[PDB]
Every structure is written in structure tokens, then in C-alpha cells.
A paper describes a structure:
Phycobilisomes (PBS) are antenna megacomplexes that transfer energy to photosystems II and I in thylakoids. Here we show the cryo-EM structure at a global resolution of 2.9 Å of the 5.9-MDa PBS from Anthocerotibacter panamensis (hereafter A. panamensis), a recently discovered Gloeobacterial species that diverged from Gloeobacter spp. around 1.4 billion years ago. The A. panamensis PBS features a configuration comprising two herein characterized linkers and presents a paddle-shaped morphology. The two-fold symmetric PBS contains twelve APC hexamers assembled as a heptacylindrical core surrounded by twelve PC hexamers, with approximate dimensions of 273 Å (width), 500 Å (height), and 129 Å (thickness).
Author numbering:
A (entry chain 5): 592 to 641
B (entry chain m): 10 to 78
C (entry chain c), G (entry chain a), J (entry chain d), K (entry chain e): 2 to 163
D (entry chain 5): 691 to 748
E (entry chain i), F (entry chain h), I (entry chain g): 1 to 172
H (entry chain b): 1 to 163
């Protein structure tokens, strides 16, 4: 949602695995959704309907 | 997922059988045509939905191997 | 079966990074908690058969409509299955005490409970009252940290069953 | 697709999509600059719920 | 992925017996020595970047052709992959060490690496040398007892030895 | 993935001319007996909880190694998967019954389920026995004639037996 | 091969439950539809050659300008293959009539039609006019229901050409 | 948002970005032709609802009488009033789904969230299972022909949702 | 997936030494003569649809069976696949032609296409001589001097022939 | 920020489930570990100016050329900024100790560190040296539990720098 | 590696379509810019040795405090590796000129640059200044276009270093 993704937040292992390609981009999207910072940005301050 | 059941990921080798190609052609090529044979890594948790969705897509499994045990 | 160490390592793997203050602290806090839970599990193990029989008679007493012939509770094979189930439940409670986490109970029984019970017509109140007798007997079995751990785990098992 | 980056398919009629989705995502996009952090207070309040309320009835 | 207590629980369940009092005693011995093990894993984690830096420096010391043209890691991307793979191997063995068991390492780390290296043509013997260099630097850094209470660590020494040895065996 | 009518049309297509009169008559007869088969499959769907309960109870009565510790249906999830597998297999059997063609049944996971159970380690003849038990419970629940008039059903049971034997052979 | 029962199967298998009232009732309805369609298809199979040839000459008559040097159909072989094309589409009309669905049509001809026409420079309007000829005859040849679903199928065929 | 034949037809046709083909029109015709027996069943069950609900009350009392014992949740005048009101609601909604010729009214009205109600209020479906069984036993003579099996289908769908 | 430029640089990095003077000279020879090849590929792209259409006409002329029921192209969508496949194979010919290296065609298409077509059961020799028809029509339109300065392109004709030949041979 | 109780709350919220025994055990462990951490916080509180000046002069010893004119360390205001930065680091380390984790430290320095390092050419080796000096001197200021946990916070920050 | 035509072909295959104008114009662009890059490669081929040497001395000069014993600059193998490094970089630069794109340079040196830069204490600005020296001699060795695109490629190498 146009939040700046700060550089230290990213998982190097997940992007490296996507670089190898054992996962599709969809799998990397899933893993990125499982990231704690994703919940911190959206699940954490906002109502469940929002 | 963290559970002993959740682990033991199972590799899945998928072939685009003629049924899958016929389904994809008539649904429309909104995605690029990819080669028929392709292996996919699927854990135990989402093991069932993978070949479920492939079956509704008309494809059939080549073989399945277990990553862990 | 899940141990605090197991969730710690799984989360670290998901983040793909080494363990920080929080994970080491959780590891420690689970480590000192290991010995009283071990004592609780052993004290439950030594009272295994008495606990099974007490749960059997407690379920007999609580619901008048379970023991009479033609019912699901009635049956020598049925009661053998009752004793086997109760032994499974208390043994997995001891297993969760061993892991210092509910994971053992969680996966071993709690996963796949409700649909199985409704497919086989198993009253959850039966297991609720059985583990309630387990609560009553384990309250006098143990005191201190072991008692608290055992009561927490059996309460979580009931809450899953309830 | 398995290999496509998700994008904003709003402002674009999707096959069998509600007329309300266009209006809602128009109200919800508001440019590139709109961030949804715990600041700006716009990612916290459910802007869409009022419009969604009208959908069930008629 | 699991730890040793999980294995004890699983075997006890599949037999259907309980964990014996001797099993409970050895688990409690792990627990009291668990504090020892956590200090060892902390020594790994703090020193892990320095451990890997030094081990890679010496690796390049004995092996020059690898960063020379024609080496499997000669392009910057490939030697970068070398660095991060050695990183992740150490991280997963650290997971196994703090777990007190090894299958947690095998299930996710040592599950698919060997076939990828065989397919890519990676020299796996060099990777085994890297892992035993992780052993060397881990021994160099974990033996440091400054700023922590002194005691016995032969159990941790043997256990980390098992983890690095089995990691090198699985990789190669 | 073609139906029985689609099957006949496919043969008429491959031979390159219009369908024959006898094929037309047999498809008309199939259309007439569709009432019977829809009755049978609707009763199956109604009796499906009863069918699965009876078959599974007889199954876990006749063998106990699944429920003993370490059994293939012991951890209380594996037997849940057992129940799910019976119900989905009988769902597929009813699919084939109403469709009038076994090719769709073979396409739907019968090409993969044998190697699936081989990889899982599940005993396949146990699965076949469960399928046959559901077949027995199904024929019993179908012979139930509640609130409905009587008609020919022997051919329906013949088709059901053929489908069930096809499923048993494909799985094991 | 999506005859009505085929998408019934697809909807059933997509999720986890068995077949409910709606799809059973739809299957029943199709199973009485089967008859008048079956006599319609039989009547058309009886009247093959005259109808296909008459359709071809109707295409000539409504499109005379091509008939000059300039038909892709000009020459005995090309006119004969016009006739065989009409025969193929008549085949598929009969097949979809039997199948109680657009199955044959959308599976074979409607699948990838427009780009093939572009590649082979064959104006669909010729085919459409041929099917309007077919409309004219089938208004008499068939009666009541058989007539109604035959007309609806060839309407869908027109729309496919468009 | 109730699911019925014509409504799911409209939803499906909207889904594929297409108009209504032969299948949906024929299904609509089948719905029109099947509505009349459903109308007869709904009217006939509307006529004699009193006997059905009272007999269901006594039947569920006979199956497991211990619920009516004092100190149980079934004993009490308010409990009896609630039993009658609940069974009336069930027959209301069953007639509704007969009229719509689809389970969707029942689905949304009761089958959505019924399970948590039973678990949170200890109302084991077995009593409502007996209620619906009595309803089917009585309606085995009330209706006739098509309407009989029509009502049987929806009441057994409610049973399967409860079971 | 390489061109002459990329592959030559690849060999240069292989030896680890810098480019040879003669290498750079061949490179300049490619570059200055490049616009010839560009005009060739542009004409190919522009005339493509007619090439597909008339080569398909020859296809249907010299064999009737595919037109008859049961042909590998007999269904409308199977012949549509036939057409799009000649399209894409000549497209890859155009790509490799512009790149001047066969490797881009090899890696991107052949490895999957071999198994795909062998599984599909379409006669590989038939597709190969269809590629020959493609080659003939393409050479007709490439010999065309339509609205372009006149010059020598014999080497370009030869290498286009070689690309068609390699495509047909691999697809055979 | 992220303190053990906060991860407990967020995780319990994720699966939509109440708290359990394991997370309460972790909270307990935090509760007893707080006291040595609070003592460490006091110790670092009363030694702040000495911490800052010693770290800056250690940076002088290892990096005196930095103070040369035309470089970063040159300039009295530059050195005021150095000391202010180091004081911010130590304050966030105190927050980390009182937090039983690295939440506020991560949030307020680690989020965006290397970016600013590249921006103003702020070599992380400088702060690695400063925190190494802080580690060495806390080897004297503290002892035992507080020493070890404060050391783990500081060297976690160091490894983040590296 | 990739040249301009590589993105051309990759995109064209991505949409699965035939090449229209724009990529063919890119093919031009590459062809006419080949020659200037050709004499650029000629010059860099002739000059390499002095370039590497001067880079070594210049980086030792403007970084004096690295030359003395006790750090990275001291030790004969260190500057031997500096020389081999500079040779490799400017060889990849020649590759970039020949490819008329970043392809070889990028995928050979730029990938993973930062983590290596702090994984071996090798300060990047060492390499930025080495390439600045290389700019220093190329501002005189080359001329015109060859100079311009050689400048641009070494600038991009620095930019990825920076
Ligand atoms: C839209 C972009 C564009 C194109 C494509 C274009 C055509 C074009 N092609 C060229 C190369 C050329 N290519 C050919 C070969 C051609 N002659 C025959 O022999 C062959 C049938 C055919 C090869 C397909 C020739 C003769 C030249 C001109 C080179 C010369 O004689 O100087 C040249 C260089 C000649 C000059 O400018 O003095 C141009 C301008 N101009 C443009 O602005
Ligand atoms: C697509 C084009 C684009 C725009 C329009 C844009 C504005 C923008 N500024 C943001 C935050 C910010 N922006 C600033 C910058 C301003 N605030 C201070 O007063 C500075 C003096 C001043 C800089 C000149 C700051 C300090 C924040 C962080 C505030 C916070 O969220 O806590 C964010 C949140 C991004 C995220 O963290 O996920 C956006 C989107 N960013 C973009 O990529
Ligand atoms: C699940 C988390 C994860 C793991 C476990 C992982 C390991 C991993 N290493 C790989 C290859 C590789 N492994 C190495 C390292 C070896 N070759 C030499 O340099 C060294 C002697 C030696 C290291 C000690 C290299 C260089 C490659 C790729 C070759 C290349 O870059 O072209 C690959 C395949 C392609 C790639 O991504 O590099 C994977 C997936 N990657 C991940 O995302
Ligand atoms: C290790 C994991 C595991 C669990 C948790 C477990 C419970 C369990 N007990 C069962 C049978 C049974 N279980 C009971 C016992 C219950 N009914 C009443 O009598 C008592 C109040 C109560 C016992 C406290 C009975 C009577 C049956 C008979 C079969 C039936 O009708 O369901 C069944 C159905 C299949 C079978 O075992 O025959 C399960 C799943 N089984 C397992 O393998
Ligand atoms: C949409 C769901 C459905 C409904 C509502 C339904 C009711 C139904 N089924 C009928 C046909 C029938 N249905 C059966 C059922 C058979 N009798 C045997 O005992 C078996 C138990 C059973 C399986 C074959 C019979 C015998 C007939 C009459 C003969 C015929 O098919 O014409 C009839 C016409 C008979 C009349 O009205 O007088 C009705 C109303 N059947 C359905 O499938
Ligand atoms: C497309 C339809 C489909 C099928 C057919 C299917 C079969 C299937 N059954 C599985 C597990 C299982 N299935 C069974 C059931 C068998 N073992 C018992 O003894 C019975 C005799 C017998 C039942 C007929 C069991 C016990 C497992 C657990 C195996 C394990 O945990 O390792 C699994 C592994 C993942 C999972 O479901 O947890 C698959 C893929 N899955 C599907 O998505
Ligand atoms: C069921 C699958 C099927 C379809 C879709 C079909 C139509 C069809 N029309 C074709 C070309 C043709 N189609 C026609 C007939 C048309 N041209 C005239 O203008 C008439 C107005 C009109 C007739 C209604 C003609 C004359 C050709 C020859 C043109 C050519 O060969 O390029 C072809 C190419 C194969 C061949 O040369 O025989 C097909 C497949 N035939 C089939 O078996
Ligand atoms: C990755 C790039 C790519 C390749 C390599 C490719 C070839 C190709 N042809 C295919 C099917 C097909 N290909 C053909 C064509 C052959 N059969 C006859 O008609 C002809 C003699 C001959 C063509 C000259 C046919 C008929 C099918 C469908 C097979 C069937 O329906 O059974 C398929 C499977 C799914 C599809 O794309 O339709 C591929 C991948 N398509 C691509 O997008
Ligand atoms: C969240 C609290 C916070 C921190 C931690 C922080 C660090 C920080 N120190 C800065 C300046 C500085 N930082 C230093 C310190 C370094 N340079 C070298 O000389 C020394 C060896 C070394 C000290 C160990 C110096 C000298 C400056 C002034 C020149 C500059 O970098 O802009 C700057 C650039 C803006 C400015 O202060 O003018 C930041 C962001 N800023 C903050 O708001
Ligand atoms: C989460 C916060 C936390 C940390 C960081 C922690 C480490 C720790 N480990 C301890 C016991 C100990 N830990 C060690 C292990 C170390 N000594 C050996 O020489 C090795 C260098 C190294 C292991 C590789 C030893 C020897 C003891 C004392 C003997 C014993 O284990 O009982 C003690 C008690 C001594 C004291 O309080 O000063 C602490 C604080 N404990 C915690 O609760
Ligand atoms: C094709 C990809 C590739 C590149 C980019 C490459 C250059 C390169 N040189 C290295 C070592 C080195 N690089 C230097 C040079 C630097 N140090 C100072 O002396 C100079 C001022 C400065 C030069 C501008 C030195 C001295 C070393 C040795 C590090 C050590 O002492 O361990 C390293 C790290 C490996 C190690 O530490 O041994 C790389 C990646 N080699 C490659 O195969």
C-alpha cells in the first residue's frame, strides 16, 4: 500500500530462493505475507474489516 | 505447519496433459503458455489443494516424492 | 510434537536469521520449566491405571444415560475403548508436559477432533467430565510448578474438547 | 498467473465484477503517495464499510 | 523439523508407552545442561559473522583458482552464493545445536542441497572443507570463556562436532 | 473428461460420420433410466453419512492395527484422512455413476492416487477393503425403498459394481 | 465436453459436498429434454444431402458477387469443400442436439474460430446466411419442442460466428 | 443473497462474462414446472402446522425424556415455549425453501452458524434430528407424489446439515 | 540463450584474457553488416502472416488426412494449434536469426518442445517438412527486393537456410 | 517496538486464539529476567557520560586520521555529533535491556541504518569500534546476569552493524 | 550476460509476439554504436598494464593510511590481488563495451557486491577510486564517442560500487 519497505526488513533467504526458482512468484508472495512486518503494517494497527 | 505433520514437504512433478491444455485454451491464455512438464514443491499443509486445483485444471500428476522422510 | 525450541527455530527459519535475545530467553525459560513438568508427567504416569478407572466411573456417574445396555457408552469392547482413550489422553498430557508445550497434545489429539467425534457420535461432554476427574485427582497429586503446569495442560485439552 | 506480479486491476472492469468495486477503489487509491502505515490514519479506518453496507440491501 | 524431546515423545507415542523415568532423567539432564547449550549457541551466533569471514578468508587462502577465472565461484554472483550458502549452513547447524537434535537441520537445510550442487556442477568437496572450517572457527570462538562463567563443554563440543560432521556428510 | 453421451459422440466424430440408429436408441434408453440412476445417487448422497459410518465401523472392527499405537490411522489425524479418503472415493464413484463414464473417474486422481499412497506408505489393500465396504453399505442403502415405488435396479447395481471394482483396481 | 451434467460434475467436485437438489433437478430436466432433441437430430440426419446442398446454393444466391472469379470457393473442388464444411457444421448441430449442450460446438468449432477465419480469409457472414437458410427450412421440418431447441442451438451457432 | 436456481444461474452467467445459454433457460423452465408441486407441498404443510409441532414436541420428549427431568436444561415452561418456537421456525424455513425450490433460504437462515449455536448452548442436534424425523414421518401421509419427495429432500438436507 | 556477441564474450571470460584483435574484427564485420540482417528479419516479420497462410495451403494440398476426421489437426482448435505452432517456430527462427546464434533457440524452445511434441504424438517428420514449407515461403519473401536498396545477402540466405534446417532437424 | 509480551499478543491474535501455557511461561521468564536487566539499566544510566567519552576516545585511538581536517572526525561540531550519536545508541541499548529484547533498538536505529551510512558515508566500523569499547568497559562496570544480557544486546547491535 | 538484443528477444518472447519497430531500432543503436566501442576496446586492450599499475599506486597514494604495515594495504599478496582485481574489472569493462551493455560487467562483478565488500573488509571506495584513476587515464587515451561510452560504463561500475 505504498508504504516504504525499509531495506533491513526484507528476508534475504526468501528472495534468494525465488532467485533459484524453486518457488513461483506466488509462493514468494505467500512467504512475504507471512512476514511479521506485513502484519505490523496492516494487521497490527487496523481493524479486521479495514 | 510447525507441527510434525506440517513438515515433510512433498515434491510434485506436474505434466500438462491434453485435458489441461484443452481447458486452458478454452478458458483463455491469460497467462503465458508454459511447458507441459514442471516440478512443484508442495508441503503437507497445502498438499491436497495442489492436486485438487490441478485436477479441476484437467492436469494429472506425473509422480510425487517426499522431501522429508 | 511441539517444543518452545521448535517454534523458535521454525520462526527463525521463516525469517532465515539467527536467534536474538528473545529466542534465547524463551529457550532458557522453557529449560527451567522442564524439570517440574517432568515431575508432573511422572506423577501422572505412576497413577495411570487409577486415573483411567476413576475417569471411567466418573463418566458412569455423571450421565445416567450412558451405561444402560444398547447405548454407545455401554459395552465391554466399548469400555475397553474408553480405557484406551483415557490412557491416550493422559499419556499425551504427559507428553505435552515433557515438551513443556501444548504441541504434543495439540497435534496428537486436538487436531482432527471435532469432525471425528461427530462422525463417530462421540459426546465431547464425556471427555470433558473424564478430564474433569483428571483435574480433581491431579490437583491432589501435585503442588507448585508441576501442579500448575499439569492443570494448565489438562485445561487446554478440555478447552479443545469443549 | 503463477508468475505474474499482482497489480491494481481496479479502474478496469473485471469479468463479472461489481459496479461498486470501481467506486470503492477510486475512493481508496487517491494517488501514488497514499501510504497505509500506522500513520496517516487512513489505513486504520475502514473507508469501504459504509459503501459495503448498501450492497446487502436495495 | 523437530528436537530430541519431540523424538522421545514420538517414539513413546508410536509404541504407546510413556516416557520412562530414565528418559525423563536424561531429558532433565539436557534441561540443566540446556543453559550450557544456549551459551554455546550464543557464542556461535555472536561470532558467526566473524567465523564465516575468517573461514572464507582462509578458504580463499588455500584455494586461489576459485576466484581466478574459470572457477566455480569466479563471477561475483557465484562467490557471493558461496558466502551466503556457507552462512546458511552455519545458521541451520546452529538451529540443530540449540534444538539438541539433528533432524531439524536435515528436514529443511540438508534436504535438497546435494542434488542441486550435483546438477550445477558445484565442487561439493570444497563445500565440505568450508563446513569443517566452520568447525575450526567455531572451536576457536566457543572455547573463549571470557565474560562468562567457566565449566565443562565437552558435551557441546561433541554435539556441534556431530552437527558439522553430518552436515559435511550430507552435503558431500 | 467426457460423459457417456459425449463418449458416443466422440466415437461418431472419430469415425467421421453421423451417429447410428442403435446408438441413438441406447442413448434414449439411458435418458429414460436416468431417472433410476438419479434416484440411486440421490439416495447415496442422503445415505452417504450412514454408508461411511457403517463401512468405517465395520473396518475398524475387523482390524485393530490402525488404532493401536503407531498405526496407519492411530494419531487421530491419519484416521481422519482415512474417513476423508473413503468419502471422496465414494463421491467419485457416484460421479461416475451419474456421468455414465469411467474415463472421467480415471482422470480424476486415479492416475495419481496409487503412487500417492505408495509414497505415503499407506497400505493400498486397506483402501480397497474400505472402498468395498462402502460399496456394500451403498448397495444396502440403495435397496432401501422408502417412500418410493419399485422399479428395475439390477443394471444400476451392475454399473455400481463395475465402477467400484474399477476404483479398487486403480487404487490397488 | 461441458454438457449440462458435465458442469454439474464440475460444480460438485470443485468443493467438498455431494450433489444437492438443484443439479439433480437440472439433470432430470435435461433427461426429458433428451427426447424432442433426439427426434430433431434424427429428422435432420434423414434430410442430410438436400439440405446441405440447398444451403450451398443459398450461399451462392445471397452472395453472388463472390461467385465470379474471386470466390475462395471458385472451382469445383472449392464449392465441394463448401458443401463439406456445411456438412461438418450439420454434424455438429446434430451432435449438440443429442448432447443437450453446446459441447460439440464450443469444443471443436467455436474453439479458436475467429483467428482461423482471419488466417484463411473466410467471411463468417457466408456461414451465417447458410444457417439462416437452415432457419428457413427448420421452421417447417421440425415442430414444437424439437423445433425450439434446434432453433436455439443454431441461434447460439450464429452468435458464435458473429 | 439467498442461493436458488435462477439466482445461481444469474451469478454464474455474470461470472463467465456471458449471456444465458440453453442450459440456464432449460433449468429455469424446470424450476417453473417443478414449483407447482412445491407450492402444493408448502400449502399442505402450512395447513396442519399445529399437529406437526405438537407431535414433534411430544416425540422429542419421548426419545430422550431425561432432558425433561428437573435440573436439566429441557425442564421448564420457558423451555417448552422455546422448543415450540424453535420447531415452528424450522417448519417456517422448510416451507420457505420448498417455495424457493432451493436450500438457500435454509442454508443462510439456519445452516449458517448453527453448529456454534449447538456447541455454545449444549443443544445436541439429536433432539432436532428427532423433530425432523417426526416431521418426515407425519408428512409421509400429508403430501403425495412429487411434493412428498420434494419436502423429503429439503428436510433431509436440514438433517444432514444438523448431522 | 546467447548471441555471437555474448557467446564470444563468454569465451573471452573463459580464457580469462582480453578479446583478440581478430575477434573484435569479426565483431565489427557482424556489426557493419548487421543492418542487412535487420532488414531481413524486418521483412520476415512483415510478410509473416502470408507466409503462414500459403505454407498452410501447401500443407493441406500435399496431405488430406489431417483435414479428414481423426487428423492431428482435424478439430478446428487442433489445426489452430498447428497454425500457431508454425507461427511460433518461425518466430524463434527470426529471434535466433537476429541474434545470429542458435543457442537462444535451443535453450528457450527445444528442450521442452521435444518432449511436448513427442508426447502429443504428432508426426515429427510432418512438422519438419512443414518447417521446410515455412523455409520455402520465407525464402520467397526474403528474395523479395520490395522497396529496399539492392545489395548482396547470399550469406544471410545461407544462414537463414541453416536456421530452418536446425529447427526442422531438432523438431524431427 | 517488539517485546516478548508484544510478540505473544500478536501471535495469539494471528491464529485468532487466546493465550496458552507456553506464552505465559515466556512472560514469566521475562518477569524474572527483568530484575537483572533493570539493574543493568541503572548501571548504564549512572555511567552515561563516561561511556560516551570513553567510546569517543577509543575511536580516536583506533581512528585518529578521521579527526584530520577534511575528514569526518575533524570539527568540534562533528565530534559533538559523534558523542550525541553514541549516546543515542547507548540509550536505545538501555531501552533494549529494559525491553527484554531488541524491539526499540531495531525500530529506532536498525530500521534504516545502512541507508544513512551510505548517505553520509558513516562507516559502520566506527560504531563497531565504539560498541566494542562499550563491551570491554561493561566487562568491568557489570557482572553476571546483567553483564551477559547487556553484552548480548550490544553485540547484537554490533552484528547488525557488521 | 545480456546485450540490448537480449532484452529485445526476452521481451518479444515474453509477450510471445513478433518484433515491431522499437526493438529493431535498438538493434540499429547497438550496430552504429558498436564501432566507437570497438576502438574503445582496442585502446583498453593496448593500455591495460599501466592502467592497473597506476590504479595500484593512486589508491595507495590518496589512501595513505592503508599502505603502512598492520592493515589491508600492507602485504604483498594484497596488492597482487589488487592488480588482478583491476585487470578483471577493466576486462569486464571491455566486455561491456563489446556487448554495448552492462550485461557482462553487471552479472560478473556487480552481483552481490555489497555483502562481499563488508564480508572481507575490502572498502569499496578503494575500487571507486581505482575506477576514478581509470577515468583519469581514459580521459586522455580515448577520444570522442569511444571515450563517451567507456566513461559511461566505468561510471555505472562505480555507481554499483557506490
Ligand atoms: C525503419 C528503420 C529503417 C530501415 C529498416 C531502413 C532501411 C536501410 N537498410 C540499410 C542497410 C542495407 N541493407 C541492404 C540489403 C537489402 N537490399 C537487398 O539486397 C536485400 C533484399 C535486402 C536485405 C533484406 C542494403 C542494400 C542496404 C544499404 C547498404 C548500402 O548499400 O550502403 C540502410 C543503410 C543505407 C544508407 O542509409 O545509406 C538503410 C537506411 N532505414 C530506416 O530508417
Ligand atoms: C511514489 C512516489 C512517492 C511519494 C509521493 C512518497 C511520499 C511518502 N512519504 C512517506 C513517509 C515519510 N516521508 C518523509 C519525508 C518528509 N517528512 C519530513 O518532514 C522530511 C523533511 C520530509 C522529506 C523532504 C518522512 C520523514 C517519512 C516517514 C514518516 C513516517 O511514516 O513515520 C511514505 C510512506 C512509505 C512507506 O514507508 O511504506 C510515502 C509513500 N513516497 C513515494 O515513493
Ligand atoms: C531455502 C534457503 C536457500 C538455500 C538452502 C539455498 C542454497 C542454494 N545454493 C545454490 C547453488 C550454488 N551454491 C554455490 C556455493 C558453492 N559453490 C562454490 O562457490 C562454493 C565452494 C560452494 C559454497 C561453500 C554456488 C556458487 C551456487 C550457484 C552457482 C552460480 O552462482 O552460478 C542454489 C541453486 C541456485 C542459487 O540460488 O544459487 C540454492 C537454492 N538457497 C536458498 O534460497
Ligand atoms: C491416539 C489418538 C486416538 C484417539 C483420541 C481416539 C479416540 C477414539 N475412540 C474411538 C472408538 C470409541 N471410543 C469410545 C469411548 C468414549 N465413548 C464413551 O464410552 C466414553 C465416555 C468415552 C471414553 C472416555 C467408545 C465407546 C468407542 C466405540 C466406537 C464408537 O461407537 O464410536 C474412536 C473411533 C475409531 C475407533 O478407535 O474404534 C476414536 C477416534 N482414538 C485414537 O486412535
Ligand atoms: C430430483 C430427485 C428425485 C425426485 C424428487 C424423485 C421423485 C420421483 N421419481 C419418479 C420416477 C421413479 N423413481 C423410481 C425409484 C426407484 N425405485 C426403486 O425402488 C429404487 C429404490 C429406486 C432407484 C432406481 C421409480 C420406480 C420410478 C417410477 C418408474 C419410472 O422411472 O418411470 C417419479 C414419477 C412417479 C410418479 O409421480 O407417479 C417421481 C415423482 N426422484 C428423484 O430422483
Ligand atoms: C484429488 C483427491 C485426493 C485424494 C484421493 C487424496 C489422497 C491422500 N491421502 C493422504 C493422507 C492419508 N490418507 C489416508 C487414508 C488411507 N489410509 C487408511 O488406512 C485408509 C485404509 C485409507 C482410506 C481409504 C491416511 C491414513 C493418510 C495419512 C498418511 C500420513 O499422514 O502419512 C494424502 C496426503 C496429504 C493429506 O491428505 O493429508 C493424499 C494426497 N488426496 C486428494 O486431494
Ligand atoms: C468441423 C471443423 C471444420 C471447419 C471449421 C471447417 C471449415 C474450413 N474451411 C477451410 C478453407 C475453405 N472453406 C471454404 C468454404 C467457404 N468458402 C466459400 O466462400 C463458402 C461461402 C464457404 C462455405 C460455407 C473454402 C472454399 C475453402 C478453401 C480456401 C483455401 O483452401 O484456402 C478449411 C481448411 C482445410 C481445407 O482446405 O479443406 C477448413 C478446416 N471444415 C471443417 O471440417
Ligand atoms: C514454449 C513455446 C511453445 C511451443 C514450443 C509450443 C508447441 C506446442 N504445441 C502444443 C499442442 C499442439 N500442437 C499442435 C500442432 C501439431 N499437430 C498438427 O496439427 C501439426 C502437424 C503440428 C503443427 C505444425 C496440435 C494439433 C496441438 C494440440 C494437441 C491435441 O489437442 O491433442 C503444445 C501444448 C499446449 C499448447 O501450447 O497448445 C505446445 C507447448 N507452443 C508454445 O507456446
Ligand atoms: C535516531 C537517533 C539518531 C542517530 C543515532 C543519528 C546518527 C547520525 N549522525 C549524523 C552526523 C555525524 N555522525 C558523525 C559520527 C561518525 N562520523 C565519524 O567522524 C566518527 C568516527 C563517527 C563517530 C563514531 C559525525 C562526525 C557526523 C557529522 C558529519 C555527518 O556525517 O554528516 C547523522 C547525519 C545528520 C546529522 O546529524 O547532521 C546521523 C543520522 N542521528 C539521529 O537522529
Ligand atoms: C537469557 C539470559 C541468560 C543468559 C545470557 C544466560 C547465560 C548463563 N549461563 C549460566 C550458567 C553457565 N553457563 C555456562 C556455559 C558457558 N561457560 C562455559 O565455559 C562456556 C564458555 C560457555 C558454554 C559454551 C557455564 C559453565 C555455567 C555455570 C555452570 C552450569 O552450567 O551450571 C549463567 C549463571 C551465571 C551468572 O548468573 O552469572 C548465566 C547468566 N543465562 C540466562 O538466563
Ligand atoms: C569476477 C568477480 C570477482 C571480483 C570482483 C573479484 C575481486 C575480489 N578481490 C578480493 C580479495 C582482495 N581484494 C583486494 C583489493 C582491495 N584491497 C586493497 O588492497 C585495495 C585498495 C583494494 C583494491 C582497489 C585485496 C587486498 C584482497 C585480499 C583480501 C585479504 O587480505 O584477505 C575479493 C574477496 C575474496 C577475499 O577476501 O579473498 C574479491 C571478490 N574477484 C572475482 O573473481
Amino acid at each position: 500500500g505504498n508504504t516504504y519497505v525499509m531495506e533491513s526488513e526484507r528476508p534475504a533467504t526468501a528472495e534468494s530462493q525465488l532467485r533459484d526458482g524453486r518457488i513461483t512468484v506466488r509462493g514468494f508472495i505467500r512467504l512475504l505475507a507471512k512476514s511479521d512486518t506485513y502484519k505490523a503494517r496492516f494487521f497490527n494497527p487496523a481493524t479486521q474489516t479495514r | 505447519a510447525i507441527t510434525t505433520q506440517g513438515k515433510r514437504i512433498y515434491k510434485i512433478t506436474v505434466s500438462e496433459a491434453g485435458a489441461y491444455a484443452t481447458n486452458k485454451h478454452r478458458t483463455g491464455y491469460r497467462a503465458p503458455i508454459r511447458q507441459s512438464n514442471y516440478t512443484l514443491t508442495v508441503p503437507y499443509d497445502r498438499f491436497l489443494p495442489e492436486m485438487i486445483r490441478l485436477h479441476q485444471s484437467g492436469a494429472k500428476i506425473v509422480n510425487v516424492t517426499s522431501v522429508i522422510s | 510434537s511441539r517444543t518452545v525450541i521448535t517454534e523458535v527455530i521454525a520462526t527463525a527459519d521463516s525469517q532465515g536469521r539467527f536467534l536474538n535475545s528473545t529466542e534465547l530467553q524463551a529457550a532458557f525459560g522453557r529449560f527451567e520449566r522442564a524439570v517440574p513438568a517432568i515431575e508432573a508427567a511422572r506423577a501422572l504416569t505412576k497413577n495411570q491405571d487409577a486415573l483411567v478407572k476413576g475417569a471411567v466411573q466418573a463418566v458412569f456417574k455423571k450421565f445416567p444415560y450412558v451405561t444402560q445396555p444398547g447405548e454407545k457408552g455401554y459395552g465391554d469392547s466399548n469400555q475397553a475403548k474408553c480405557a484406551r482413550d483415557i490412557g491416550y489422553y493422559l499419556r499425551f498430557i504427559t507428553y505435552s508436559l515433557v515438551a513443556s508445550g501444548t504441541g504434543p497434545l495439540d497435534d496428537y489429539v486436538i487436531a482432527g477432533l471435532r469432525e471425528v467425534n461427530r462422525a463417530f457420535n462421540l459426546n465431547p461432554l464425556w471427555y470433558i467430565e473424564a478430564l474433569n476427574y483428571i483435574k480433581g485427582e491431579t490437583g491432589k497429586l501435585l503442588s507448585g510448578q508441576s501442579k500448575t503446569e499439569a492443570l494448565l495442560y489438562i485445561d487446554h485439552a478440555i478447552n479443545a474438547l469443549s | 498467473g503463477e508468475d505474474t506480479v499482482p497489480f491494481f486491476r481496479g479502474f478496469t472492469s473485471q469479468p463479472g465484477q461489481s459496479t461498486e468495486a470501481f467506486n470503492r477503489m477510486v475512493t481508496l487509491y487517491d494517488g501514488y503517495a497514499t501510504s497505509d502505515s500506522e500513520w496517516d490514519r487512513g489505513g486504520q479506518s475502514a473507508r469501504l464499510t459504509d459503501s459495503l453496507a448498501r450492497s446487502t440491501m436495495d | 523439523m523437530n528436537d530430541v524431546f519431540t523424538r522421545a515423545i514420538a517414539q513413546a507415542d508410536l509404541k504407546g508407552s510413556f516416557l520412562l523415568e530414565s528418559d525423563l532423567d536424561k531429558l532433565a539432564s539436557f534441561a540443566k545442561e540446556g543453559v550450557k547449550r544456549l551459551d554455546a549457541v550464543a557464542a556461535l551466533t555472536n561470532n558467526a559473522p566473524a567465523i564465516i569471514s575468517d573461514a572464507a578468508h582462509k578458504l580463499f587462502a588455500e584455494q586461489q583458482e576459485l576466484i581466478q577465472p574459470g572457477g566455480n565461484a569466479y563471477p561475483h554472483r557465484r562467490m557471493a552464493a558461496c558466502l551466503r550458502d556457507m552462512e546458511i549452513i552455519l545458521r541451520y547447524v546452529s538451529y540443530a545445536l540449540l534444538a539438541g537434535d539433528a533432524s531439524v537441520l536435515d528436514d529443511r537445510c540438508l534436504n535438497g542441497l546435494r542434488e542441486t550442487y550435483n546438477a550445477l556442477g558445484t565442487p561439493t568437496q570444497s563445500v565440505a572443507r568450508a563446513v569443517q572450517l566452520m568447525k575450526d572457527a567455531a572451536m576457536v570462538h566457543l572455547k573463549s570463556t571470557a565474560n562468562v562463567t567457566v565449566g565443562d563443554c565437552s558435551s557441546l563440543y561433541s554435539e556441534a562436532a556431530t552437527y558439522f560432521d553430518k552436515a559435511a556428510a550430507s552435503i558431500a
